[PDB]
Design a binder for these strands. Structure first.
Ligand SMILES: [Mg+2]
Ligand SMILES: [Mg+2]
Ligand SMILES: [Mg+2]
Ligand SMILES: [Mg+2]
Ligand SMILES: [Mg+2]
Ligand SMILES: [Mg+2]
Ligand SMILES: [Mg+2]
Ligand SMILES: [Mg+2]
Ligand SMILES: [Mg+2]
Ligand SMILES: [Mg+2]
Ligand SMILES: [Mg+2]
Ligand SMILES: [Mg+2]
Ligand SMILES: [Mg+2]
Ligand SMILES: [Mg+2]
Ligand SMILES: [Mg+2]
Ligand SMILES: [Mg+2]
Ligand SMILES: [Mg+2]
Ligand SMILES: [Mg+2]
Ligand SMILES: [Mg+2]
Ligand SMILES: [Mg+2]
Ligand SMILES: [Mg+2]
Ligand SMILES: [Mg+2]
Ligand SMILES: [Zn+2]
Lengths: 107, 129, 242, 146, 36, 151, 125, 173
RNA sequence: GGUCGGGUCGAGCCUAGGCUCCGUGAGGGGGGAGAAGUCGUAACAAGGUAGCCGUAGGGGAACCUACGGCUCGAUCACCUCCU
RNA sequence: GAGUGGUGGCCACUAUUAUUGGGCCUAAAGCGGCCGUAGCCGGGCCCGUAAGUCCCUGGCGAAAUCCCACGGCUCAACCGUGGG
RNA sequence: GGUGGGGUAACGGCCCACCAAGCCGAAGAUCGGUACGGGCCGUGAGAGCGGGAGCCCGGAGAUGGACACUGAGACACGGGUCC
């Protein structure tokens, strides 16, 4: 099945209605890549991405990091340390607005 | 400890020319130092140079001709765009076409004049005049 | 707007495609909702007063409109707020003249004189297409209007095709497909008002819009958005364009 | 001391923090941003003020000058604070009386403060009962209500 | 206390060591009264 | 300079640049591997084996022959010992430093006031922790390995 | 009265100071506690944009569906259980997901009676 | 932010009392009979702006730079400050005296319509001079080359009569 | 629309507890200017006991004394180490 | 010069805040000494990748405000049409 | 944060019932100070430094604090209720 990403679907199926592969959730907007740095809450992960910001006065760079909370479907079940792809969705909780759609490199 | 082989080589050359030395040895060699030396030779700032093989990273033997006012590395290695060379010229050079800035591009190492003719930017690594 | 819809428009905030002197007065006409959108149309008062010059003041422009002297796409229009947009035909029968509304090379709206015969047809790009009750097809055009076709015809119309329509009778007479070798006229963007032929079509994932490469007459290739490319012919234009 | 640091391409945050840290050593910057002058100004940021005269006095000039400088004690209308103000001109102190209202402004010394051989006085009289003092000292005009 | 070696110079001032002793004597009195 | 004392001593070896073994060296690779195994079984360190091979058998370093198995690399004493299963379980420099630290700690139990020697123990344990960081990074030590003197 | 605008807390735990009054378009309404009764009772709510909602306050009948697609209108006896709230079953409160007993057996409610005005259920075998 | 504020068209000296500058400016003021310093300063600023455009265009390259380069040359020759075959480098040799020679006051005096600079100023202010059929009363107006030779007495002026007493005295010079 | 029952939300008000701020305030303390009312002469020359740092005790006041340190110490004789 | 002086504020003066571009033996200023965590800075060669970086091209960053030429108020200030 | 509901024009700890221990922080949380944001404006060779009343676009308010009726749209400056 395709959801417009162009990536392979997960190995097995799930019953989560909040899953974009086997449920009714839709993805639309930005797609980010990052690293998991926390997986304690049920079906929730924290994803961190690094980037450089340019300081015009000092003509030099500094490193900044972006942290995003995302929903973790049971068929994927990402864990701390691996690379993930996440896609934007409709509000799911107070802080959750993305869903994990693929593990790129297991830790 | 050693951090930057190219900076040592250029500071060594500028120290040696100020007291009239006719040749120098550049002790830790590398490919980038070789490309910089080729560009310097093309514009007439040095004479012949040769690679000498130890069991280590190699040595360069370079002939000097007393034609260098000054030469030095540029740290940090600032990126530059293809139509932005003038302000860097005013930063490092004494008149409008006096000397060369040495630039690392994805087409190789070259003077800023050749790169400006090709229409490309890159990273500044050295100046010689 | 603290509590309700806005009903006013300052001259300095008017759309950039109008030919209007932006500092001469405080207020401009706030156009009425209608066929086109705000970026691709202009109120009729500026056509009567500012463009053609048939009236000096708003009061005598309104008297001209109320007597029924101006036709838009073959129908009498009396509202001075009525929006007039891309590919419409403006007709004055008491003087016997006709114009087509088209964008400039700079993106501004202008009037292009045409023949009396060509004034009977309006090209309409197919913006959307849907099923409707009774299992029929509704076509939704670029100027906001709609048409119905039977289920047997469903393979002769798709989005981005152009339909030449006889106005004001609203009768179909020709379907022009969107494909390689078709003749197109650009309506928005940096390459606005350039025209030519279709070379290639490209698509992307996750809802980013699709792009087209176009060869002009002098042999140069340029790109634009697919939805900015308005089909006007097979291999020659079917309407008169500057 | 070695080479000035940090020079690295990816050391922007530390360089910015260094500049911010040592900028607080500049007394001009610190006074402006902390608004210290506003906290203690009896004129409350104004260029001029109005007050009522309570008494006349005389201040000795500093060494090695000699002479007596004529001044007044003034109570400001806006907040009730009392300040000393100089009366410029030859014979100017004769045009002032107790219970009169005056307009004062800065005396014009370095750093917006006092000047000359009279430190301690920061202000000068410009108007007396709404008439320019310079005119009165020269002539050309008369002080009203006797 | 912090070091100010310029204060040790003698032109136009009394000896810093004894100034320091006087300051410490004054600080003891304040700390005693703060306890009552 | 020296890591802690900041001295600038220069003594060391001066190896000439050469590719092949010299003409006067008659030993083959098989003899050299046999000699290395015999010396290791006699109980010598990897540094000591090379010293004996240089001094007594006229063999300048074994890093003059190509590896008969892998043509991408030259021969070393540790690689030869690995090929037969007699390689050290802990890297030798770490082992020697740990051994020095154990002897010094029991001296300090009987001499609690010997403070100058205690700073030497502190410097040695700094060296040990630098090496353990490096070896864990490379995978030559398990991730759970820890250095504890009470062991 | 009932405000549904935004939380007064940041995710870090810090407090938020409101910067405007409550807007009318942000308000909620009282919940409909749909009871089991002998007779039905519903009311009509005028909603945003001049729309309507049918709110069921007391229910006496249910539409019960099978896996074959046939439906029957039957009367409701009582609420056996409701996982939404621990004491709804004691009070006979009907919501989506509640288990009801009818003359033809137990069923699970699939409708939102506070929003739709009717009770629809699937028959449990 | 802040809305637009209309700014001065002339620049003042960086120091009011420098002896050499005072002497030079006094000579210019006497020679061309200007009314005050700011008038002179106005013309100085015009000159500076021209040079600043040439300095920037020499060190530029591209497509808009060329259009600007030819527009600057065309405007300068329309005003009559450069000959028809001048190049960009010639912009850097212009002096303040070149600009003052283009004032309508100066040109009225040069053609022989007045006897003195002061008389030319009064003739302009009172409305006795026409430029290409139009009466202009600003002595500082800079005359274009294409209209320089159509500058005469106004056809309704007393001076447009060769027997007028004041005109005969002007002609006697 | 009145009257009563129940549920629930709620500005304001009262009492007590804790912090916080402005206004006066007996008494106590050093700081800065002034010009000299007073007692001495500590710093500068070997300043008439070389000066100064750390710590501690003592004295109207500058200051004195003890242990460890620095030269930012004069003079003469002798010795050592250099160019 | 129809203006010209006084008072208060910001920028410049000032390389007295220093990326460009400052200082620390005797003038303000190197922690009494050392070990080490994060951060910053890191030796030579070969192969891969393409995140940083460079080049080309699609969609955007309202108008007013700024620069240039031409045109309309006597010229100008101001206003319009085009280019940036 | 999860599961099951309610409510809303609509997604949502927006609010409830039940189950877990999570969430933010020396790369500065929390708390305190000051302030409507931007297009732009002043100054300087430039790098920069300072300001953001007047015109345009967005936000908020109608003596202070709460709360409703009508309406497509308001909890309404020249409409309603309480303190
Ligand atoms: Mg209103
Ligand atoms: Mg889309
Ligand atoms: Mg503002
Ligand atoms: Mg003495
Ligand atoms: Mg004595
Ligand atoms: Mg003494
Ligand atoms: Mg004693
Ligand atoms: Mg300095
Ligand atoms: Mg010092
Ligand atoms: Mg030190
Ligand atoms: Mg260290
Ligand atoms: Mg390297
Ligand atoms: Mg890239
Ligand atoms: Mg704009
Ligand atoms: Mg004209
Ligand atoms: Mg003009
Ligand atoms: Mg304009
Ligand atoms: Mg729900
Ligand atoms: Mg405020
Ligand atoms: Mg602000
Ligand atoms: Mg105002
Ligand atoms: Mg009021
Ligand atoms: Zn799934």
């Amino acid at each position: 099945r395709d959801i417009g990403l162009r990536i392979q679907p997960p190995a097995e199926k799930c019953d989560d209605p909040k899953c974009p592969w086997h449920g009714h959730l839709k993805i639309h907007g930005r797609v980010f890549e990052g690293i998991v740095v926390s997986d304690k809450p049920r079906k929730t992960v924290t994803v961190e991405r690094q980037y450089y910001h340019y300081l015009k006065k000092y003509e030099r760079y500094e490193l900044r990091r972006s942290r995003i909370h995302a929903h973790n479907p049971p068929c994927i079940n990402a864990k701390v340390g691996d690379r993930v792809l996440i896609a934007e969705t409709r509000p799911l909780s107070k802080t959750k607005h993305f869903v994990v759609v693929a593990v790129l490199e297991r830790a | 400890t050693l951090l930057d082989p190219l900076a040592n080589a250029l500071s060594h050359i500028t120290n040696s020319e100020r007291v009239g030395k006719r040749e120098v040895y550049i002790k830790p060699a590398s490919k980038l130092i070789g490309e910089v030396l080729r560009v310097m030779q093309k514009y007439g700032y040095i004479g012949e140079f040769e690679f000498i093989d130890d069991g280590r990273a190699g040595v360069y033997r370079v002939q000097l001709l007393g034609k260098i006012n000054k030469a030095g590395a540029i740290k940090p290695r600032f990126p530059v765009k293809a139509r932005d060379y003038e302000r860097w010229e005013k930063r490092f050079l004494p008149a409008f076409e006096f000397g060369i800035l040495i630039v690392s591009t994805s087409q190789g190492v070259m003077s800023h004049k050749e790169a400006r003719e090709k229409g490309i930017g890159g990273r500044l690594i050295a100046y010689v005049y | 707007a603290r509590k309700g819809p806005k009903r006013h428009l300052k001259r300095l905030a008017a759309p950039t495609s109008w030919y209007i002197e932006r500092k001469a007065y405080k207020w401009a006409v706030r156009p009425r909702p209608g066929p086109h959108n705000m970026r691709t149309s202009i109120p009729l008062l500026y056509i009567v007063r500012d463009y053609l010059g048939y009236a000096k003041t708003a009061r005598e422009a309104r008297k001209i409109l109320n007597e029924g002297k101006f036709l838009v796409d073959g129908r009498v229009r009396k509202d001075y707020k009525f929006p007039v947009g891309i590919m419409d035909v403006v007709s004055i029968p008491e003087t016997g003249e006709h114009y087509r509304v088209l964008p400039n090379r700079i993106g501004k709206l202008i009037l292009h004189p045409i023949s009396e015969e060509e004034a009977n047809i309006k090209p309409l790009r197919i913006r959307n297409k849907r099923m409707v009750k009774g299992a029929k097809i509704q076509l939704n055009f670029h100027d906001g209007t709609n048409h119905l076709i039977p289920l047997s015809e469903k393979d002769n119309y798709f989005t981005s095709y152009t339909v030449l329509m006889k106005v004001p009778e609203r009768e179909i007479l020709e379907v022009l497909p969107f494909e390689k070798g078709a003749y197109v006229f650009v309506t928005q963007g940096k390459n606005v008002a350039r025209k030519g032929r279709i070379v290639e079509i490209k698509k992307f994932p996750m809802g980013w819009p699709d792009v087209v490469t176009i060869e002009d007459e002098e042999g140069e290739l340029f790109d634009t958005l697919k939805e900015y490319a308005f089909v006007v012919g097979r291999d020659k234009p079917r309407i008169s364009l500057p | 001391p070695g080479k000035k640091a940090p020079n690295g391409e990816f050391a922007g945050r530390k360089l910015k923090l260094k500049r911010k840290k040592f900028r607080w050593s500049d007394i001009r910057y610190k006074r402006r941003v902390l608004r210290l002058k506003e906290k203690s100004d009896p004129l409350e940021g104004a260029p001029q003020a109005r007050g009522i005269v309570l008494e006349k006095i005389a201040v000795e000039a500093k060494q090695p000058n000699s002479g007596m400088r004529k001044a007044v004690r003034v109570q400001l209308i806006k907040n009730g604070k009392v300040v000393t103000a100089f009366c410029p001109g030859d014979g100017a102190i004769k045009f002032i009386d107790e219970h009169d209202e005056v307009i004062i402004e800065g005396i014009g010394g370095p750093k917006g403060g006092s000047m000359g051989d009279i430190p301690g006085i920061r202000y000068k009289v410009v108007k007396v009962n709404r008439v320019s003092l310079k005119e009165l000292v020269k002539g050309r005009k008369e002080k009203p209500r006797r | 206390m912090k070091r100010r070696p310029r204060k040790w110079k003698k032109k136009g001032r009394m000896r810093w060591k004894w100034i320091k002793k006087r300051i410490r004597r004054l600080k003891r009195q304040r700390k005693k009264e703060r306890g009552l | 300079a020296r890591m802690h004392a900041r001295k600038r001593g220069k003594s060391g070896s001066k190896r000439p640049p050469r590719t092949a073994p010299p003409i006067w060296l008659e030993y083959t690779v098989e003899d050299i591997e046999n000699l290395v195994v015999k010396l290791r079984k006699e109980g010598y360190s990897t540094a000591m084996i090379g010293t004996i091979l240089r001094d007594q058998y006229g063999i300048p370093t074994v890093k003059l022959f190509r590896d008969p198995d892998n043509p991408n690399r030259k021969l070393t004493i540790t690689r030869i010992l690995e090929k037969h299963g007699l390689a050290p379980e802990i890297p030798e420099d770490l082992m020697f430093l740990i051994k020095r630290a154990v002897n010094l700690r029991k001296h300090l139990e009987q001499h609690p006031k010997d403070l100058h020697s205690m700073r030497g123990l502190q410097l040695i344990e700094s060296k040990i922790r630098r090496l353990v960081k490096y070896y864990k990074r490379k995978g030559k030590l398990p991730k759970d390995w820890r250095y504890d003197p009470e062991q | 009265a009932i405000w549904q605008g935004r939380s007064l807390r940041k995710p870090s735990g810090g407090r938020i100071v409101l910067a405007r009054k409550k807007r009318k378009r942000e308000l909620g309404r009282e919940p409909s506690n749909t009871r089991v009764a002998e007779q039905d009772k519903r009311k009509i709510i005028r909603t945003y944009g001049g729309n309507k909602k049918v709110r069921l306050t007391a229910a006496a009948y249910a539409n019960v569906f099978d896996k074959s697609g046939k439906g029957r209108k039957v009367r409701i006896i009582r609420v056996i259980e409701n996982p939404a709230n621990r004491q709804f079953a004691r009070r006979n409160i009907i919501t989506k997901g509640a288990i009801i007993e009818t003359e033809i057996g137990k069923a699970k409610v699939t409708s939102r009676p506070g929003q739709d005005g009717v009770v629809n259920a699937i028959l449990l075998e | 932010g802040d809305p637009k504020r209309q700014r001065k068209k002339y620049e003042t000296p960086p120091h009011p009392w420098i002896k050499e500058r005072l002497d030079r400016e006094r000579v210019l003021m006497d020679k061309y009979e200007l009314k005050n310093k700011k008038e002179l300063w106005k013309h100085e600023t015009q000159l500076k702006n021209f040079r600043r455009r040439a300095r920037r265009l020499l060190a530029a390259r591209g497509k808009q730079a060329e259009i600007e380069r030819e527009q600057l040359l065309a405007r300068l020759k329309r005003l009559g400050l450069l000959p028809e075959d001048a190049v960009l480098d010639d912009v850097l040799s212009l002096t303040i005296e070149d600009i003052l020679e283009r004032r309508l006051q100066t040109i009225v005096y040069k053609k022989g319509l007045a006897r003195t600079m002061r008389q030319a100023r009064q003739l302009i202010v009172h409305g006795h001079i026409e430029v290409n059929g139009q009466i202009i009363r600003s002595p500082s107006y800079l005359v274009l080359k294409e209209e320089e030779d159509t500058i005469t007495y106004a056809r309704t002026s007393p001076f447009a009569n060769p027997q007028h007493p004041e005109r005969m005295m002007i002609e006697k010079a």
